[PDB]
Amino acid sequence: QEIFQYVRLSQVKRDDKVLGYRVSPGKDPVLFESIGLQDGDMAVALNGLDLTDPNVMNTLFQSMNEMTEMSLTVERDGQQHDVYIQF
Template structure:
């Protein structure tokens, strides 16, 4: 061997390894397979989604036992322990027995998505969604209250109501009257369909009469 040649011992090899002369070893990570999204099953509850409406508060018209009712997000179906979890354009998501289920819009030619504005919509897809006073009574301006105390019929000077019918009244289309102070205080938007005001359910034909009686004392 050459006089200047050097024999490498184990310590030299270890030193070379520590210096990473040939690059640092990088273990190849095994890609983690993401779980496939679980499809949401169609509900087997004996209910039918007849219409969906969008506005300040989206609502779903659901038929149960031959009767239709408007439900808002978070509300519970009448005779079922199911809650409206989410309202979409062609279906709603229900939470039933701890699981999420889908209720799709009925596949009928006349069941269309309703929009609460000035556009023409199908009566089958109820527009009844505006319920600005569901959680708290409407504060009626003093001047309006005084006028209504003298004559409750003057309500129509402030809010114009047109009944929306489908096998009975399902709500009232609202727009401001000559004086819009009460309309604005109620939280309505022009083109909304009112289904309740001061805890009076407008799907009940007697509700408007009851509301008229309440006005002077609100």
């Protein structure tokens, strides 16, 4: 699957601790806009799992060829909602 078509991510850290990921537009505006992301959203979970747990994320990514969809939880103006990514 090609996450980079949908979104770009950068770390937001306190010292060496990752707090979440800043969202930037992916390669394809149709995907970024149709799923309702906005530049500067803060991504905090993927499929309900904490994005800041690298081993958990590694395991999830190893399975992604079997995935047909994902949810990205983002924080915007102090509120959270889920963004639905269709593969």
